Subunit: 30 residues, 4 copies
């Protein structure tokens, strides 16, 4: 239930943050 | 119950981080 | 024990990430 | 035990995010 869904949501957010950071890095590298 | 409250706070902070990174991405690429 | 220490470490990391993002924002604003 | 393993993974991802943000900060300010 709630603990496992919150953990899943957190892991999804961390994945999305990692993508955003990789995109920013690529933008800075041109 | 305590774990649930801490995980909820973690999710909220990650959501705020995502928004801040979306803004930085838009500043660099917009 | 371990659950509470891991949660504390995570909350500290989130705080540090929020500072880094605020610093980056200020750097972009000059 | 499961919570402990997920929290450990969350801490590891946050550490990686911190490093990526330190690099971006250095690119902009260095």
């Amino acid at each position: 239930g709630e603990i496992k869904q919150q953990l899943a949501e957190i892991k999804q957010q961390l994945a999305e943050i990692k993508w955003q950071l990789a995109e920013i890095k690529q933008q800075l590298a041109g």
